[PDB]
Each structure stands twice: as structure tokens, then as C-alpha cells.
Amino acid sequence: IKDMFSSAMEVARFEGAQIKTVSGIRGEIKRALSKPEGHYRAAFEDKILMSDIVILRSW
Amino acid sequence: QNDLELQQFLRESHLLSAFNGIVYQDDQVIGKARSRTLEMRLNRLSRVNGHQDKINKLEKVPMHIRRGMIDKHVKRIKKYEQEAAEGGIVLSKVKKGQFRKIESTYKKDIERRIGGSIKARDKE
Amino acid sequence: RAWDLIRYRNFRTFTGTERIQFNCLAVDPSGEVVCAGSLDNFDIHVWSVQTGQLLDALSGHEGPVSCLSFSQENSVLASASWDKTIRIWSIFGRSQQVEPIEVYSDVLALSMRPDGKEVAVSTLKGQISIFNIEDAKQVGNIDCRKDIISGRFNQDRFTAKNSERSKFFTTIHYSFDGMAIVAGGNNNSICLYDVPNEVLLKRFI
Amino acid sequence: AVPSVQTFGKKKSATAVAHVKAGKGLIKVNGSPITLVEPEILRFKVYEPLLLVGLDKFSNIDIRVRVTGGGHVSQVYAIRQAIAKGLVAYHQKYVDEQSKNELKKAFTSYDRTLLIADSRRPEPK
Amino acid sequence: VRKLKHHEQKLLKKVDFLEWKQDQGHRDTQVMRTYHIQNREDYHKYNRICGDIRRLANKLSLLPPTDPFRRKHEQLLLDKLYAMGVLTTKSKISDLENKVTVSAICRRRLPVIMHRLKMAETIQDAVKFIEQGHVRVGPNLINDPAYLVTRNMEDYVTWVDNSKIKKTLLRYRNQIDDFDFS
Amino acid sequence: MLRRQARERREYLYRKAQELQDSQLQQKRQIIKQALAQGKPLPKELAEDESLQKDFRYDQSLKQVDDEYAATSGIMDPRIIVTTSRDPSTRLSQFAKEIKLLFPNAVRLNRGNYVMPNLVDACKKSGTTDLVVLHEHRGVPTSLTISHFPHGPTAQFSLHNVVMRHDIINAGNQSEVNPHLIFDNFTTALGKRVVCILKHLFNAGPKKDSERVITFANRGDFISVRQHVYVRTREGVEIAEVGPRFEMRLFELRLGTLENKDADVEWQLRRFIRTANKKDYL
Amino acid sequence: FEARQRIEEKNKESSDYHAKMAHIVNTINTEEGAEKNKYERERKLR
Amino acid sequence: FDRTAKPVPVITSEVTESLEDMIRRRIQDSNFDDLQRRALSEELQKAHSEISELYANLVYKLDVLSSVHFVPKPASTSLEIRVETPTISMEDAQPLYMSNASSLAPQEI
């Protein structure tokens, strides 16, 4: 997942959070990728598409 | 009245004496006494909630031999209770349309084929 | 079960743990261990004779163990089964060594040379193959399914030429000089051969 | 219409189908001749079914082999197995059984892995 | 036999030239038609054994319900018939009266085993093939249709090698290796 | 034995489907059993069916380890292979050494070029019972899969806080005697299933004074595995820690061997469901 | 650390709320349906 | 934000201490979850004898019908009395013999 964070520190702050696509596919962020900074690895209920947007509902 | 083993022995005293100290308690009752005893218990339990047209199904016997079965059984009943009446002997009391249950009733398994009473006359 | 032929007593009885029926056995030369194989279990059951216990269950055949024989000199076990495989087990002394020799078809009646050097197996193709045990390579075979007298039954509707009922040997045995093999099966010919030349010496009706 | 015979030779994942029939004497692996089978140092591994028994057995029959799978040495072992047991099966079915088991004896005295592969492995010690 | 009129059919009702009461509804004929049984007396040779099993099962259910003799022999007979293949489940002992049946002993015959193993397209084809001598159990060729195949002994029902049927299935998938004759 | 094992699994799952299908007759036969016991009237459904009572005459003589392990529970000792993933690192080879020392009747197999289908076939015709496949991540071992072989279950776990006996110190040699076991709060039916899986790979009947013990203590779906030796003093019992400690978490449990992944899943970790983190042995 | 603490406090809050709502539902059921059935019983006499 | 699952527990000295004294309680009470190594009546007697001979005949013809591939009887540690006698006398009727020992061993006499 590309750009909801600006740094791996930010993703480290937000690890384990539950996200979802706009299709309601639930998911969880797992680990920040190393070289592209705000990019991370998430796991979903099944295969999401390239035309989706993930969402971290915070308050 | 709420003793179970005592009342089971009381109402299965007849076929224990027909198919036999004596044994009466289950885990000691050998074959035909066991089959008819268990069948009698299951009938008496199932006659509460089960339907009366479905609990006591008679064995299908043809007309001209079931009527002869009934006539010879009633001849046995009349001869027995007449012999006891001309003797002193006090007999147990039956209802009005029922058959008197005798030793040939318990041995010959006659009530599966003829019922306890002619239910056409009971209905009318 | 074991029988003393002095006091005429069955002194030992060996069962398994799996309730199987045994079809062939093999004893040690130095009779410490009896061994037996079934046609419904794929294992070989290894019992001590001195105590009565089940010493081992050898596993590794993927077909019913048709025949067992202990080598009389070096005491190596040879089993052979309907998964087209003869197998050589070094049981004694820390080895637990298994050498599987594959063969062309499913084996019934292995037999063992008196010096334990070679093993002759009878196969369902109709052949008797002879293998060197220590260097597990075939020494030589006899092709026996064309000198077999297979008669015609009364009930069957196929000729004795085209029948596949009895053109193979279900029992073979070495001579005691190691040079010949007598063989018989479900047919009315028994044939004996000399294993150097692999040629039929004589056939008996 | 022709007397023909099909056999199979296998090593690790190579597999070779050999059709043997009566003919003029041509031995062709994958369309090309047998004298083109690379890696060219194992061409005698391919040749030894011919040189063990003589070319006068192959003077009247033509073989063709189709080899898929595997690597270089697994393919030459599949080729030699297919050729060997195809010659044995042809001499069984259409020539006499005495030449059949003479061929089996010669190949088995050289190595029986020309005729029977080593197939199912390992051993769980 | 001539479709009696109303007065005749009323006057002789019990007349039937085909179906009698001793026939038991022609069930020997019915299950021997189902499982293609050659000889007439195989139904009744199996019916004797079903009557043995059910006679023992009656006389064994007439024992008291807790003694180990009844429980051991009921379980032992149940295990034996499941292993032989007549019974399809060794769970309940009412199988020893209800589910023991000439059709179960007939489903264990060799052509029916064959047809269920997809080894022949019908039971009559399986009869023809094992009469023609194509089928071996284990190593030895089985020649008669009535052969009863137990549960562990149905793993070895194959064709004989050098069978034309084995050759044509191998050559249908062109896996025929002519080295081992098929 | 290919055809025998295929048709034996076929008959077993036929019998299991028939049990769950006709398991209503078991409990209504239980109802009429206790109706004979205390003379209380029988319901209408159990009162009007005549066939069930005349089967009950036959069926009045009817009456822990489960269906895969039940045949040979204490009869026969296990036989375990311990193998790594493929081309393993040296710390995974050290961990596989430690797991083969954990389980008695376990050997270790070198892994490389072993396909998992013919590995499973070689094991289940050479007679082994269990296979433990270990997976790593840069040294740190991350999973172990236990496959019980006569078409039994596979339990797949992840391993989480792994400290190794090779990693700590030369504290000596291990004990290798048949240990005692401890299972702490395995309370659900999945807990008993996992207990039976994890404990039918130890030898039956250790000595009563067998001086090593190994504990599988459940702490919210995180089975802490430690191994201890002990010697009972005058005042308590003194515990020393020996051999590896980790936390395994079951994420999958299916009903076939390792090769297929077409087997029916008994349980697997629903991670993304809405009420995921609210229950244990979920 | 905040993960474990927030999850377990949310679980505690949900398990308290479900108990509280089920309690008030069946107390309204029991101690007022007894009066509903009492009124129906003394209305059936009319 | 809400989070999906609880994190993996950190193993500190408190949880190792709690786990060790759990182990100590179990190990001093020997609470170990190990694997554990695996005449009547006249009428009842004659009922038993009748179904025994029925069972014998039925098992015989089931074996012969099954073409004697069967599964054997489970186990019976029976009890045999053998008297002592010459093994001449334990033989068949023919002119010869094979062994003239006594059927009981010296350590059985």
C-alpha cells in the first residue's frame, strides 16, 4: 500500500491496525517496507484490486 | 404407588409365570419373557402421548380366521369364568366390552391378533 | 506357533497386535528369531523365540509380503512382495539396513541359496530371476512360461493357450549343491533347471 | 498395418517414448539422427544399446525416440533406456524369444538400469 | 388368463397363474435380475446364511441387555460381517436384523465389485469379462462370477497381464509399454 | 497399499458421515432408555414409530482419544521425522536438532530436493507416524507443521518467542528420557484435539520418577512450550530449565496429510472477522 | 502495548454492556409479563 | 484506531515465574497429563451354549463363503492341562515311532 503514510516511523506507529478497502474487504497492516518510505505490506480477506482505496478509520 | 420395580413386577407377573426361585429383574430375564416384557413396558410408556389409532396396531389377520380366533377365545373365557362362578372362585373384574385376560391370552399371544375388545362395538 | 518334536508340545505361540493372518514364515539359522509375513498387512513380524515378544515390525513393502527366507550362512533376511520388489534386511547388529531390489513384476516364491550368496525369485511374468545379495544386481534369469503345462478347465470358455491362470511358478526351491531349481505352481507341470546354464533339465507331468 | 512397438525410458523428470518398427535401419532421436544427441560426451551412453549387441540387430528395424522433460544427462539416460527396452520388446513380439532373452541377458549383464529404472525414493531412516 | 369378466372375477378372485404366495413376490428372480445371478439356487443358498445371521441375532438379542456374552458376540458378529462386506456400518445391532440381506451378500459378488470399481460398464459386462478370464484377484485368475470379495480383498481386483482389455486401456491413454507385454 | 489406504480413508469418512447423519437415533434411543429407567411417558414422535422400538430390543446392549489416534494409542510407540523447509539456514538446522531431541522416537531428515508428495509417500509406507516440518525467517524459526500420517490431521503452528539451547550456553547435554507432560487450560474441544495431536508423539507410559518434564501451557491461544528437569528437595521441588522455549499459535488444523491442501479444514484462524479478538480458541 | 490494552478494555466494555442490556430486557419480561398474564387471567373470568 | 488482533505476548520474568510455579504445583502433586500404556444360572448357561454353537457354525460357513480371507478371532489366553505320558503314546497308530521321551520336562516333574 502506497501513500497514507510519509515514513516507516509512521507505519511503525500504526502497525497492526485494521484497514479496509472501499469494497469492504477487511484487512490489517503488517509491516513497513524498507526502501519506499510510507509504503507497507497489508494482508486482506482476499485479493484486492488495483482500482481500490484502503481506509484507516481514525478519530 | 410410585415404586417402579414393584409395580412392573405386579403387572408383568402373568407372563413371567407363563414363560418362566423365579427371576423378575432385568439383567436376569431370558428370551420370550424378555421380549414380551420389554414390549409391554414400551406399550405402556407410549400409550400416553401417542395416538390411540397408532399405538396398538393389530396384526393383519383375515376375516374368517380372526373371527374364529375370537369365537374360540370367547368360548375359553366363558368356560373359565363359568367354571369359576359355579365354583367359589373370586375372579378379577373386567370392563364391559373387554376380553377377560386368561392364561391362554398370555401364552397364545392372542391380543396382538384380536385386540383387547371389539372396537367396532366399542365405537358404536 | 512352535512345536517341540521331542515332547510333542506346542510351547510357543506368537501373535501380532493387528489381527492379521499369516501366509509365510522364516526362522533364523541360530533360531533366536522367527519371522512371518501376511498377505493383508505389508509388514513383516519379527518375534524372538526365547522370550515370546514381538521384537520388531519391519515396514517398507507397499504390497503384500508374499515370501520370506533367512540366508542360512550370513543370516540376512530376504522378503519379496507383490509390489514387484525383493528386499534384503540386515537385522542383526546395529545396522537396521534395508536394500530394495526392484524387479519386473510381482513376486511370489523367493528362495535362497545354501551359501546365502544369491536369491532366486519367481515372478508373475513367468520367470525365475537370480540376484547377487551383497552386490544387489541380477546374476541371471530363466524364462519359464513357455515350458509350463497349463491345462484347460471344464468350466472356462478360453483355451489353454490364451489362459493366464497358471503360467508362472508359485513355489521354487534350490538344490543343496546350489546348482538346480525345482519349481511348481498352479499347473500340472513341475520343472527343474540348472541355474548356471538357465536351461530346463526336466519337466514332470 | 506395420509391426510396431512402443516403450518408455525414464530418469528424474525426462521421459522418452521409443517407437520401434520394421524398416531399413534408421535411429532418430527427436527427428534428428542419433549421432547428434548432445552433450556429445554422453553420446556413447546413448550408443551402448547399439554397441552392446551389434548393429546387425538394428539393420532391419527403425527406431524413433521423442524425449521431453529433464536435463541433459537425464535425457540421455531416458534415451538409452527407451532404446534398450524397445529393442527387447521388438525381438520379443516379432523375432524369436531366444534373441529376446539373449538381449535381456546382454543388457542386464552390462547394467539392468538400461531396462529397469531406480524409481521411488528416499529411505526414512 | 383371458381377462375375466365381472361375474367371473367376482366368482374366482384368488385365481392367479403367475404370482403365488409361496413365491414371496418373486424376489429371488428380482435380485438375481438386479445382480445378474446365473444359477437359480444362489438366492436360496444366500437366504440360508441370512437366516443363520438373523436367527443368531434374535436368539442373541433375547439375552439380558447387559451381559458381556451378548455384548461380545454381537460386536464380534458385527465386526465379522462388516469386514466381509455384507454390513456397511458396524455401529448399531439392528443392522443384524434389518440390513442383513441377500442383496448385501450379492453386492459383494465379483461382478458387482467390478462394476462399482468402474472396471466394467455393467454387471453383465463384468460377468462376461470374468467368464472370459480377464480378471484376477491377487495373483490367481478368478473364473466364476459368484466369487465374494471382502473389503481387504477388493484392493487386489485387477486385470490379468496380457489382457486385451488392459492393453486397450493403456493404449487409449497411450501409456502402453510393450516391454512388460502391455 | 495405495488403493488400500485410499479406500480405507473413504470408508472412514463414509462411516463418519453416517454417524453424524444417524446420530439422532442415538439420542432418541437414549430418551427411550431413560424412559424405561424412570417410568415416565414417552413423546409422540418416539411413541408412534413402531420400527424404532422393535429395533430397540436389539439395540438395548449399546453404549479421550479420537478417531485418527484411537486405534494405536498406547499400543505402539510413535515414529517422527523432523525436517526443515528447503535449503535451510544453520540456525534452523540447529532448531531441527533441538526438536528431534525434544521428541523421543524422532529422527531428523536432511531436506533438499525432496518433493512433499513423495516425501509423504515414503514416510507413510516406511511406517513413520508423524512429520514435523520447520520453517524459518533469517535464522529465526517461524512455523512448525505436524502431520500424523495414516491420513491423519495436520496442525500448523507459528512459533513466536524462540530461545534456543544452542544459543544460550554450554549448559551440558540433554536427558532424552521419556518425559512427563503438562497441559495447562486446554478447555475447549479444539483444546482437547490439539492436546491429543501434541501428545500422541510422545512415548506411552514414562517412569514415575522420570526426571524431565515438558509443558504445553495455553495462555490465550499461545501455547508456551518449556522443558524442565527437576529434583525433589526436602521443602519443595527444584526446577531447572533445559532445552528450547517458544510459544506456538495454532493457525490451521486440517484433516489430511501435508501434500494436498484439498483436505477438509477442521479449524483455521479467522483473522479479519469482526469479532476476531474477542474469543479464544476461536 | 497500546494494542493489548485497548483491545482488552474494549472487550471488557462490550461484555459489560451485553450483560446490562440482557438484564434489563428479562427483568422487564419477567416482572411485568407476570402482571400481563395476571390481568389476562383475571380478565378471562369475565 | 482499532486493531485487528492482540500482539504476541512479551515473555518477561513475571510470566516465567508464574509459569514455573504452575509447573512446580503440578510436579509436586504429580498432576501429569501423560499417555497411559494400554457359574451363572442354568437357563442363562444353556442360552449361552445354544448361541455358542450357532455362532460356531455360522462363523465356519462365513469363512468358507468368504473364501477363507477373513480377520481372525481377537485373543484367548486359555488354560491347558497336559498329563505326563510317553510320546510313543502321544502318536499315531503305525508300526514305527519317532521319539520315546516323556511329555513333561524334568523341571516340570
From Swiss-Prot, chain A:
Subunit field text: Interacts directly with RCL1 and the U3 snoRNA to form a stable subcomplex. Component of the 90S small subunit processome also known as 90S pre-ribosome that consists of the 35S pre-rRNA, early-associating ribosomal proteins most of which are part of the small ribosomal subunit, the U3 snoRNA and associated proteins.
Function statement: GTPase required for synthesis of 40S ribosomal subunits and for processing the 35S pre-rRNA at sites A0, A1, and A2. Controls access of pre-ribosomal RNA intermediates to RCL1 during ribosome biogenesis by binding of RCL1 in a GTP-dependent manner and, via its affinity to U3 snoRNA, delivering it to pre-ribosomes. GTP-binding and/or GTP hydrolysis may induce conformational rearrangements within the BMS1-RCL1 complex allowing the interaction of RCL1 with its RNA substrate. Required for RCL1 import into the nucleus.
Lineage of producing organism: Eukaryota, Fungi, Dikarya, Ascomycota, Saccharomycotina
Subcellular location, record wording: Cytoplasm; Nucleus, Nucleolus
Superkingdom of the organism of origin: Eukaryota
Protein name per UniProt: Ribosome biogenesis protein BMS1
Source organism of this protein record: Saccharomyces cerevisiae (strain ATCC 204508 / S288c) (Baker's yeast)
Family of this protein: Belongs to the TRAFAC class translation factor GTPase superfamily. Bms1-like GTPase family. BMS1 subfamily.
Swiss-Prot record, chain E:
Entry-linked Pfam families: Ribosomal_S4, S4
Domain S4 RNA-binding: 108-174
Subcellular location(s) of the protein: Nucleus, Nucleolus
Keyword flag Transferase: no
InterPro entries: Ribosomal_uS4, Ribosomal_uS4_N, S4_RNA-bd, S4_RNA-bd_sf
Entry's Gene Ontology cellular component terms: 90S preribosome; Mpp10 complex; nucleolus; nucleoplasm; small-subunit processome
Superkingdom of origin: Eukaryota
Gene3D superfamilies in the record: RNA-binding S4 domain
Biological role: Required for the early cleavages at sites A0, A1 and A2 during 18S ribosomal pre-RNA processing.
Protein known as: U3 small nucleolar ribonucleoprotein protein IMP3
Species, as recorded: Saccharomyces cerevisiae (strain ATCC 204508 / S288c) (Baker's yeast)
From Swiss-Prot, chain F:
InterPro entries, per database record: Brix (IPR007109), IMP4/RPF1 (IPR044281)
Domain Brix: start-end pairs: 78-259
SMART domains from the UniProt entry: Brix
Assembly, per entry: Component of a heterotrimeric complex containing IMP3, IMP4 and MPP10. Interacts with MPP10. Component of the ribosomal small subunit (SSU) processome composed of at least 40 protein subunits and snoRNA U3.
This protein's GO CC annotations: 90S preribosome; Mpp10 complex; nucleolus; nucleoplasm; small-subunit processome
UniProt name for this protein: U3 small nucleolar ribonucleoprotein protein IMP4
Main location: nucleus
Compartment(s): Nucleus, Nucleolus
This protein's UniProt keywords: Nucleus, Ribonucleoprotein, Ribosome biogenesis, rRNA processing
Gene Ontology biological process terms in this record: maturation of SSU-rRNA; ribosomal small subunit biogenesis; rRNA processing
Keyword presence, Transcription regulation: no
Gene3D superfamilies per the UniProt record, alphabetical: Probable brix-domain ribosomal biogenesis protein (3.40.50.10480)
Gene Ontology molecular function: RNA folding chaperone; rRNA primary transcript binding; single-stranded telomeric DNA binding; snoRNA binding
Described function: Required for the early cleavages at sites A0, A1 and A2 during 18S ribosomal pre-RNA processing.
Highest taxon, organism lineage: Eukaryota
Classification lineage: Eukaryota, Fungi, Dikarya, Ascomycota, Saccharomycotina
Organism for this UniProt entry: Saccharomyces cerevisiae (strain ATCC 204508 / S288c) (Baker's yeast)
Mutagenesis or variant effect for R193A: No effect on RNA binding
Swiss-Prot record, chain H:
Function: Involved in nucleolar processing of pre-18S ribosomal RNA. Required for the early cleavages at sites A0, A1 and A2 during 18S ribosomal pre-RNA processing.
Stated family: Belongs to the MPP10 family.
Designated name of the protein: U3 small nucleolar RNA-associated protein MPP10
Lineage top rank: taxon: Eukaryota
Organism: Saccharomyces cerevisiae (strain ATCC 204508 / S288c)
Subcellular location(s) per record: Nucleus, Nucleolus
Summary of subunit composition and partner proteins: Component of a heterotrimeric complex containing IMP3, IMP4 and MPP10. Interacts with snoRNA U3. Component of the ribosomal small subunit (SSU) processome composed of at least 40 protein subunits and snoRNA U3. Interacts with the SSU processome subunits EMG1, IMP3, IMP4, KRR1, NOC4/UTP19, NOP1, RPS4A, RPS4B, RPS6A, RPS6B, RPS7A, RPS7B, RPS9A, RPS9B, RPS14A, RPS14B, UTP1-UTP18, UTP20-UTP22 and UTP25.
